[PDB]
Every structure is written in C-alpha cells, then in structure tokens.
Design a protein around this ligand. Structure first.
Ligand code: NI
Ligand code: NI
Ligand code: NI
Ligand code: NI
Lengths: 122, 570, 100, 570, 100, 100
C-alpha cells in the first residue's frame, strides 16, 4: 500500500546480454605504471599498447560486459576477462587506426599492431 | 552474462513486461516491446558506449544516415503504444524510432539512426517520453501563460485573444484581419506553437472569411458574440470552403434555440464542441448530449476535471468574472447557476473513461488553468480506476488501455481535430520533434525537459552559477531554443491554406516555421484515437440525470487527488 | 524543488503578508496592498492546511476588520481571489467584501 | 599651486607611484606612468572641465578626431601595463589611450582624443579598468549563465552546447552543421561575445570539417566522445587546414594510450589543453605534464582554483553528475576518484605562479562556475603571495609583476589561444571596446559597469523608480546595449574563415558583428604573455608528486580566502 | 548591496524554507518542495556559519526525518545539492538520501 | 495588490534584511550586503511608520556599529540611499557613513 511515486515493478527473470555470440576468455596484464580502464565497446585489439595479451584474440571482439561498464587494470595487474564478438557489419574505423575496415583482415591488423609496439603480437 | 531485472531497469530504464507507476497515482504502465539489442544499448558519458569507433560512427557525414539528436532508452507513452526505444531527430523532425548507434559494430541499428560526429545526445533512460500537449482552447490573455503551459508539458496553443480585453477574457477570438495580423506578429516572440481563431460570427460570408485569408487557422463560435443559427451556419460554410476547424460554445440561454436547433444549423458538418459538459458554456442543461454525435469532436475544459468536493463551490464567481456578469442582475446569476451542475460533472468523468469525450483542453485564464490540462487528465484516469476498476480491455495487471485512451485526449486527438496532426500530436516518424521528458515520480506534474523542434526550450534546472546544473534552486526556466532567432526554427505558426497561398507570412515578416491547417472537414468522432464512441446521450431536463444505453451515469466526488499536495509549494 | 511559475510568484504573496503582519504588530493601520496580502496569504495557507473552499470563502471575511486598516480601505476591496492547491487539487477561493 | 597626494588621488584617481589594494586581498598595484598633464585633467559634471569652449571642443564634427566616448582618469590593469590614462572609443573600438580633451586650450591632448559635440563621458576616476574576460571553456547549458558571467567581468564565451542535453552537460560541443546553425541563431539573443566549438571526433575528415564550414570557430576533443589517437589526429588535421583552435580533454582512463601516446598523436601541432591539472579531465594521474610542452597552450578550470580545505570534498559528486556516471558501478567511481588528487591541485597553484599554466577558464555548469574565473584568479595570486612571498621580479613593494602575470590568464592569453586577439583580450588601440570598470573595493568580485562594443551592457545599479540610480536595491542589471537591435552591434560572433567566405552569416540571417578566427596554428607556449615557461614536469605515477627542475612543488590548502564572505549574500 | 544573479535567486530558497518551517510548526507533514527547501536553506546557512563541506554533507541527513514528511517524500529525494560561500569561497554540498 | 515594479523589487530588501537579522541573532558578524540590507530596510520601515526624512538621515547612523560587522565593512559603506513612501509621498533618505 505504501506509494513510492514513479516506482518500478519489474518483471521476473534476467536479461542475457550479447546472446548467441561466441565468448572467449583471455588473460590480460597492465605492464605499465598507470591504471588502464577499458570500456565495453572498444575493439579489444586496439587498447593501450602496454596491455599484454594475445592480440590476435582481441580482433573482432570487445568485452562481454554490460553496455557502459568497463574493466580496470591497476599497474602490474593481470586479470582474466571474457570477450564477445562485435556485431553489425564487423568493421572498425578510427580508434587506434589498426583496422580501418573489416575485422577479417587479421594479418594486416597484427602487422600494424606489431610495427607500432602493441604488446602481445606473436 | 545475465543482468537481473532490477539492475537492468536501474541502468537502462525498464524493458519488456516491467511496470512503472505514474507519479503518485494508482496507474501502472507496462513496457509492451523494446527495440534494443541487449548488450548494445546506447549510453553516453565518461567511458560509455557512444564514443568514436565504438557506439559512435566516425565515418559518415551528417547527410549519410546520421542524426542531429538521439534520445537514448526512452519509455514512450503514446496513442501508438507504450514501449521502449531510442528516438532519432534530424532537421527538427522525428526521423527514426528504434535503435541508435553504430552499424560498424552493433547489431540491430535502425539504418537512419546512426550516432555520428553531428549527433547530440539526451539520456532518456528512466524517463517517460510523450508528445507535447496540444491545447486547443487557449485564451491569449497574459503572455506569462506560456511558461505555465510549458512547465506542464504543453507545446501547442490553439485559440484566440488580444490580451486582457473583455472580448478575449470571455472568448477564444482574435477578431478581424488587423487583430489577427497583430497577434501573428506577437506570436514571433512566444516560445510555443500557435494557431489563431477568428470570430465565427456574422450573417454574411465575407466578414468571416476575410479572417481566414488574413491568417486565422480556424474559427470560434461563442454565445457572448451571439451563437445564433446564422452565425453557426455561416462559420461552417466558411470552414468547409477553407478547410479549417470551427469550435463552438453554444447558446446556454436557449435564446434562439435549444440543442436540437443548434444541431440542425450544424446540419451534419464537422465541429469541435468545446467544454462539452457545459459549465464552461452551452445549452442548459443538455449540451453534453453533443458528445454522442458522429460529426462532433468533443472536448472538456479543465476546471471540472475530475469531480471533487470543492469543484462546485469555485465555479459561480469564476463564471461571473469570465463572462462580464453582474451580481445585482438576477438573470445574470440565473444564467451562471444554470451552467453549474454536479450531475453533468459526475457524468463527464465517466464519459471520458468510456471514450465518449475525446479531448481535454485548458480554457486558460477564462474558466481554465493553463498549466493543468495534462495534470487533470491523469487525475481523472486515476479517479476512474479507483471508482470503476480496471477497464475490461486491460491485462497483466497494467493500465495500458486506460493510459492510451487518456494520453490521446491531450496529444493526438486535438491535433486531428484542428487539422495539424501531420505535424504534431504524437511520437511518430515524420512529425515535428516536440517531445516531453518526465521523471516518473513527476509524471504529468512537472516536466523535466521540453524539446521543441529538436532543441530544448524549457527545463527544470538549477543554479546557473553552480559547478553543475543540479544544485538548488531547481525551477522551470527557458532554454536556448527560446533565445534569439532560434525561437523561429523551434516553433510553428499554424495558418489557413488561403493565407499561406496569399503570402501573409512574407507580408508580415513572419520568420517562424509555417504550418498548414488541412484535412479538418472530412473527419468525425470515428477518427478520435481510443475515444471514438457514438451513442445516444439522454439528459433529463428536470433532474439533469445523464443516461447512456438505459443506464444512469453517476459517480461520487473525491476529497483528495494524487498529483496535488505532495508536489506543489502553493 | 521543481518550482513552476506560479509557485515562484506566490512566494512573494507570503512575503508581503509577513511584511504587513509586522507592520500591524507594531501598531500601524494597514493600507490597501498590505490588507490584500494578509487575506490572500491566509487563504493559501488555509488550503495547505486542508480547509475547504467553502470554509475559506467565509473565514476570509473575519481576518481583518475596519479598525485594522486605513480609512477607505474596506470600501476599496470588493473581493479577494486566490488559487491554491487543496487536497483535491487547485481551486479558486473568492471572498466577497472581506472587510466590512 | 600644489595639491597633496591624498587629495589628488581622491579627486582624479591615483597617479605615478601611488598604490591600490585589490579588493580585500594583500595584493597592491602601483601606477607605473600617467598620460595626463597635471592641471588639465578631464572631468565631467556641473561646473566641471568638459564643457563647450573649455575641455570640450565646439568646432569639430565627429569624423574630425572626435570621440564617441571618453573614459576619464582610468587606472588600467592589463598585460601591457598598470598605468593611468583616459581611454577613447569610436565606432565601438578603442581608438586612443592617452589624454582626452580640447587641443584649443589644453596641453598634451592625444590628437584623436578630442571631446566634442559627439562625445559621451564615463568617469573612471577611482576605478580600475580591465579588458573583458575571455572564457574559453564554456558549456552552453542554461541561458541564465550569461548574466552570471557578465557580473564577474566576462565578455566573451567560447565553448559549445545546445542546452541541458547530456552531451552538452559533459562536453563543450555543439555537434554537426544543424546544431551549430541553431546555436548561431540562438546567439543573436545572447548579450555577450560567442564562439562555438564543434565535435572533434571522427576517423574521416569530412564529418569533422563540415562543422567548421557550418560556422564553428574551433573544435573540442573530449574523452566522453572517445579521445582516441584517431579523433585527436583528424581534428588537428582539420584545424591546421581551417586555422582554428582545438581544445582537448584527454583519455583519463588511459584506455587507448597514456599521455605519451596522446602527445605522439598531436605530433607537435598546436593544441589548447583544458583543465590541465586533470580534476576536470585527462590522463590519470599525469595529464598536467602537458603544461611543460612548447606546442601546448595550457588552461585551468576554476573549481580547483585555489587549493582550499573544502576543494577535495566537493569534487566526487560534482564529477559523477557532469559525466553521467553511476554510483553503483565500481569502475565509474574508480574513474572519478582517479581524477581527484590534492598533490596535483597543490602543484597547480604553484604552476600558475611560475607562469607554467597560462590561462584560466570556468568550465561553466560542467565542473565549473560561470561567474568565478576572474574571482579565483585573484584568490590564487593572493594565496601565492602569502605562501611563496613577493615574486623576485617585483620592486617598490608592489605586486605589479604578479598582477600582470595573472590578469593575462583570463584576458589576452585565451584570446591568443583561440585566434581572436586581433579583436579582444586587452586594452589596446585598435581593439573592440569591451571594458570592465571596477571599484577597487569590489575588484575581481562584482563589476561596476561592463562596456560591450562601446555601450554599457551590464551594470550594478539601483532602484529604477528612484530620483537617482544609486538608491537600493543595487543589483546587476542588463543595460541598453542588450536591448533591441543594439545587441547586434555590441557583440561579436566569432566564426571560421571558411564559414565567413561561404556566406553563413547571410544564410542564417545573423545580424551580430562577425569576427574572424585566425592565426591559431603558428603560435605556442612562447606566445602566452607573462606565462611562457616550458620545462620538464615530472609526475610520480605512484605518489602523484610533481617535480620541476628537480624540486617538488607543493603547498598547503587554506581555510579562508579573500573575495569571499565579506561580499556575498549566500 | 551589489546583488548578483545567484544572490537574488537564493533569497527565494531562504523564503521557501521560512514558509515550510511555519507549516511544520503548525503541525503539517511536509511535502516534496517544502522538504527540499528546508534542507537546502540549512546547508547555505551552515556555510555562512563557517561549517565545512564535510560537516554539512553529514548534518544534512539529520535535518528532517520520515515522520516530518508525507508518504513517499523520503524516497522522492535521492539527494540535495547546494552551493554557498564558505570562508574559503564557493563550494558544493551534496547530501545523499537526506531523509531515511 | 496592484504591485508596481518598485514594490516588487523592494520586497527583496525586506527579505535580505530578515535573513541578515537572523544571522546577527545567532552571533555572526555581518558582511557588506547584510549590513546594507538591514540599514536599508530600517529606512523603508521608518518611512512607513511616518518618521521624517531628517529623522532617518540621523537614525540610520545608529542601526549597526562596527562591532556588529566584519573588518573593513564600515569603511566599505560610504553611504546608504533608499526611497520610500512617506506620508507626504516618495522621498529619498541618504545616510552618510552609517557605521563608524
Ligand atoms: Ni466557452
Ligand atoms: Ni473559453
Ligand atoms: Ni573536460
Ligand atoms: Ni568542460
């Protein structure tokens, strides 16, 4: 009976994000001396050079976390994160200028990443 | 990964099946569908999704499917549905309702709703968004009335007047070509959409028609100027030629005829019956029977909305002042008293709930309150739920059917009646971006932000000297859409086709957007969304008892309303 | 607070009433705007208290008497009108000839 | 005859060697030189000197070396000097600084400073006169912010926004051609100079450049739209072609890079680093190191100015509201907390005092106070005198070196940075007559009169119903310069060269004076007047300790400031 | 006096608080804008008194309790924010959930 | 009430004076606008009471003393001027150096 003006009465159940997309777990380390925080929708291969991980596993992917959230890496911190696949046209432009086109061009993306010193290209 | 419902709703606003309480009423709206793709919700801010290469596309120029403005995560309440979507605006118009963002990387982006370099963002997560209110019974008496209207979510004022002249204090009339021209020029400084009604009185066509050619958007027939069979007939003849609407306040006195005589003069032609219950004017006691007819578009004005224990006591003195009546003339008092009837006011609540009265309006400053059309619509719906129960049409415990029926009364239906629904009156693609954001706790009471033609015109916002806009005092204030020449692009002056063809805007130097009034003469009660009921309404001439389908319509007045003392400082 | 235009304006009736009440308390006969302000604020506070419109229409005639005001002030005030939020929404109170 | 110093100063204002206290600070300015001829001082009033045949010439027409306006006996405080002169204005511009009057009978009259039939007089004896403040970090959120700015002596607003939309509440951005056009039209009603920044985000050139062609005067790169290497690069490419300035709020999160990566993307090109200390935004914790570089024009925003005992406690909630962050998201809180550091705030005071941070700005309504740029500049200077002592460069016990260093931060330096110093930013011949008169007791706190284009636009003045203008209540009020079409001639809209060449003002019907942005790309830290220091700034990533020349920069927060509770009602 | 725009506006917070305090004193449960006004004026007067921002952030939670206000008012007020001139200049006070 | 522009404006002097008087009563030394407001409202209320201009020109020097105000405030106030409706119409009161 108590009235909270404008209150919600939410339905039962839960919301599954990024449903039907392949998920991938990888380990990532901040090798730098200042904190790095990574948003939900940045093309994962294009993050800060001083994050160390298998860069190939970030291609065409982003963090599998709620839209508008982030993963924070303190200096020296290693964490396991889960990635999901990019959707739509699966193209990335700008950001770190590693892709500028289809994410399918893995060899080109990695060549650029390696030349520019993004850590973790094999 | 999964997110629980409570946390999802707190972050992005509600989704399918979730319910929201309207202000402090008992009314609950339920999300019917959601255009999002879960995980790709648009949001803006530090480290959020709408950033270049991510949720914001960095490739396309403005003309390439990019928006000027995205409202993210809106809960839309409209005659078309109660549902969750992003709203995309471009060139001052709603161009997309769906899912905004960047097709590079997001699933399910509506193709013309790209967030690009050109895109501003308004966060609507946790807000209810409605069309701006369309008030078709406005007396232009005091320019301070505009902010009053904006603060309760009204974005279009249709009516008449020249300021606090007795003619205007009684009637929604801007009389003759010169007064109309003057008020069209005045309108250049009013931060709201406007249409002007001429005097629907005369026994020759030319004096009436020349008002339409001068720039009027319609006519008002009012008993204070003589609501005679001749004035009714000539006005409707003019309206049928000009494709504009006629509003009527009929002969309360029954001087030249009873209701049946007025209907005979109308002769099946389309007409908007103002304050159809009759306290605001009309054939005593039976004018509300108008609302049963197929050619009548019926509205209420707001002081009788809803029936409360103080309603009757305020009315006599209100009426005497409005209509320039004298306490020492017994027949003036008898006329006033004849209009004030608890029987018809009580029935008016029910006729709204049944979809027999299709529209609400204010009657601003002439037996009506400029800032309470929206307010009193929801108070009426709440009272009816309490007294009549959920409507039979409802399901899932929600009040969605009632909510669509009632929102239509002050948005789409008045727009349809005045021939302006191609431009305004609902949240639909192709219409002008007049949008009102509400916090659910303030829904129908105090608007958060009022968007006019795609730019914020009015907002509840705090200290202009503060580090952020939220510190006190939070009050309604005019925003940049009202400043300088931007007032011209964010507002519409609605005018007759003939005045537009004759170049009246150029003649007068009008810089506002010019809207065309059209498709007014080919409509009827059947075209009133969610409020299309025709029926024989019987009103007992002795007792004032109102019957529909052999059933007396009555209800009790209430001692308390929601959307009242919890909110208001006075 | 979310103040609307009327809430802002009506603050200054309360203020004018407070001013006038201080003038009365120090022994002054009240003038026209002072008298109107006191009676108006009385009505709006009465609504806030939850009185009916009918109660206030009558109480408003007993707030100030002719000995409280200057010569001619009673005859200058034909009525006082005020709107306020009652428990059942905004209503208008009209007080006829509030000072005999 | 001789006049003693005290009496001379009381009659004509101070002269050479006299000192004046700035408000209730410990800061004293000394008159360096005086352009008068003793005995021929100009003054106006009953039986005074500026009368026909006497100090007013009765022969010459307006075009013959006669002024529209003479400010008599001004104590000028400017980057160019602290000195006593008359100021002559004609056609809205400063045309003479020197000695005004009548060459018929007075010695030493500056030849183009004749007081004639055409000349108005403002008495500046006993006043300090400065250039109008140039605020280059303005969020256009609430139009009420303009009077707030005028009241503390600000006359130019550079920044962006469309009103209280979330994009604008976070970022100084008016995005895309349509929003820019709308805000240029809005600007026609704002009684202050304006320039508008577009969104400095994209990975293709055309979406960014079309904003410049539409009428933007510069760009803002902001992390809330993605302060990525690509957006940085494309914006600077556009700016170098268009000759406009770019402001940057960098990637606090270090998401796509650390500070060194942002500097690499900048690649030696000119850029204005906003809120360089970093509470207002930027690479955590070391963004203030930007201010050591030769290609960076560094400004502070005002809530960290100066370091006080309450500074830290207000910031977390301020930041969360500005950037649309959620208390229930741990990483949102961590991001906010990362920006708030007493170590860098304390060092910021000292970097200002050393001439390493060159500019002040507000950040109005988005982590900043629209009416406190000037105020907090002087509070900082006062704190530094108290804690660090008089600067080594001073002499005669005066604080003139500090005063020139600090006045430059909110006048000439922001004008130089945005390419508008040919028009505004200092009291020099040939510049627009945007002038602020201050009573010394109110200096930096409340402006007496604000002159815009040679007409008073804002003033602290009393009862409009009184026999004279001094009776209470004395409050800030808009004057005739803001009324009617005079608002067009007393204010400048600053625009890109390309938009001007493409006829945008005629296209939009802009009637304001149109100022050209130019000479933005060929400047550096060396061009910041009195604040030209380049050095290696080291910021410890663990402790946030700031070092310059091997020396830790730190100071204590203060419990009290001048220019505070003595003056303000709230 | 040299009142600037904020000084003028903030007078009406003090006034609304005085109005609300009178309503409370005569036994009324306070509504939303009344409650906001009281707490806001409390903060600005606290700054004038020379309290710290941190003191007021905490004191602001103890000015009104749920029995002082109408049903739902505590839940309507997520926070109250106010700026005032402290001894060390203008500062912002944010009070979270001021009425439990 | 028929309030004209000056009547509206001058309400806010009375209000600022009430604010300042409350600050004084709780033991604060008054600042510049507070001091001006108190003395100004004193003058306007004196006119309403029917004092002469000459009486108020002198009384205005005895409303606040230097121990009532902050350091430097006495020297900041060279004079205070106020107009009000006396029994013989609007007149101007100028108080020179109201606080020694
Ligand atoms: Ni009517
Ligand atoms: Ni009407
Ligand atoms: Ni910033
Ligand atoms: Ni900013």
């Amino acid at each position: 009976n108590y009235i909270v003006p404008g209150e919600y009465r939410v339905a039962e159940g839960e919301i599954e994000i990024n449903a039907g997309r392949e998920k991938t777990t990888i380990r990532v380390s901040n090798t730098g001396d200042r904190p790095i925080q990574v948003g939900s929708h940045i093309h994962f291969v294009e993050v800060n050079k001083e994050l160390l991980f298998d860069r190939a596993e970030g291609i065409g992917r982003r963090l599998n976390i709620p839209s508008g959230t982030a993963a924070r890496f303190e200096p020296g911190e290693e964490m396991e994160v889960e990635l999901t696949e990019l959707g739509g046209n699966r193209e990335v432009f700008g950001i770190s200028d590693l892709t500028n086109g289809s994410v399918d061009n893995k060899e080109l993306i990695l060549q650029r990443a390696k030349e520019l010193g993004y850590k973790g290209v094999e | 990964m999964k997110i629980n419902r409570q946390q999802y709703a707190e972050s992005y606003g509600p989704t399918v099946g979730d319910q929201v309480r309207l202000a402090d009423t008992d009314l609950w709206i339920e999300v019917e569908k959601d255009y999002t793709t879960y995980g790709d919700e648009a949001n803006f801010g530090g480290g959020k999704v709408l950033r270049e290469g991510m949720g914001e596309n960095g490739t396309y120029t403005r003309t390439e499917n990019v928006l000027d403005l995205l409202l993210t995560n809106a809960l839309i309440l409209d005659y078309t549905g109660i549902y969750k979507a992003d709203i995309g605006v471009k060139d001052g118009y709603i161009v997309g309702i769906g899912k905004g963002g960047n097709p590079d990387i997001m699933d399910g982006v509506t193709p013309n709703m790209i967030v690009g370099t050109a895109t501003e963002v308004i966060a609507a997560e946790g807000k209810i968004v409605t069309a701006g209110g369309i008030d078709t019974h406005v007396h232009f008496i005091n320019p301070d009335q505009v902010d009053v209207a904006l603060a309760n979510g009204i974005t279009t004022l249709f009516g008449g007047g020249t300021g606090p002249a007795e003619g205007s204090k009684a009637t929604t009339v801007t009389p003759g070509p010169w007064n109309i021209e003057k008020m069209l020029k005045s309108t250049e400084g009013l931060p709201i959409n406007v249409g002007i009604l001429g005097k629907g009185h005369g026994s020759s066509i030319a004096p009436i028609m020349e008002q339409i050619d001068a720039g009027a958007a319609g006519l008002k027939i009012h008993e204070d100027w003589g609501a005679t069979p001749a004035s009714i007939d000539r006005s409707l003849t003019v309206a049928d030629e000009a494709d504009v609407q006629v509003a009527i306040h009929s002969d309360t006195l029954n001087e030249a005829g009873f209701l049946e005589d007025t209907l005979r003069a109308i002769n099946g032609r389309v007409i908007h019956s103002f304050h159809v219950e009759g306290a605001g004017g009309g054939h005593a006691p039976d004018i509300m029977a108008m609302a049963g007819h197929p050619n009548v578009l019926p509205s209420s004005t707001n002081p009788t909305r809803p029936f409360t224990v103080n309603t009757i006591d305020e009315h006599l003195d209100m009426l005497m002042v409005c209509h320039h009546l004298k306490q020492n003339i017994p027949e003036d008092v008898a006329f006033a008293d004849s209009r004030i009837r608890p029987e018809t006011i009580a029935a008016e609540d029910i006729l709204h709930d049944l979809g027999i009265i299709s529209m609400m309006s204010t009657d601003a400053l002439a037996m009506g309150r400029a800032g309470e059309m929206v307010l009193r619509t929801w108070q009426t719906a709440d009272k009816m739920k309490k007294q009549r129960g959920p409507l039979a049409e409802e399901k899932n415990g929600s009040d969605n059917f009632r909510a669509k029926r009632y929102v239509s009364k002050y948005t789409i239906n008045p727009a349809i009646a005045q021939g302006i629904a191609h431009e305004v009156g609902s949240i639909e693609e192709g219409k002008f971006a007049d949008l009102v954001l509400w916090e659910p706790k303030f829904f129908g009471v105090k608007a958060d932000r009022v968007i006019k033609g795609g730019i914020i015109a009015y907002a509840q916002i705090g200290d202009p000297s503060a580090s952020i806009p939220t510190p006190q005092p939070v009050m309604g204030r005019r925003m940049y859409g009202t400043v300088g020449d931007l007032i011209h692009d964010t507002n519409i002056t609605f005018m007759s086709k003939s005045s537009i063809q004759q170049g009246v805007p150029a003649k007068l130097g009008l810089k506002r957007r010019i809207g065309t009034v059209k498709n007014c003469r080919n409509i009827g009660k059947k075209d009133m969304k969610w409020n299309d009921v025709t029926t024989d309404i019987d009103i007992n001439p002795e007792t004032y008892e109102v019957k529909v389908d052999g059933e007396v319509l009555t209800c009790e007045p209430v001692k308390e309303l929601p959307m009242a003392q919890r909110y208001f400082l006075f | 607070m979310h103040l609307n235009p009327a809430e802002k304006e009506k603050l200054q009736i309360f203020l004018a009433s407070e001013l006038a009440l201080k003038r009365k308390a120090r022994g002054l006969k009240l003038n026209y705007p002072e008298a109107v302000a006191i009676i108006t604020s009385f009505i709006m506070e009465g609504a806030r208290d939850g009185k009916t419109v009918a109660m206030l229409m009558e109480e408003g005639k007993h707030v100030l008497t002719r000995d409280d005001v200057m010569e001619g002030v009673p005859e200058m005030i034909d009525d006082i009108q005020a709107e306020a939020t009652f428990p059942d929404g905004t209503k208008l109170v009209t007080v006829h000839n509030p000072i005999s």
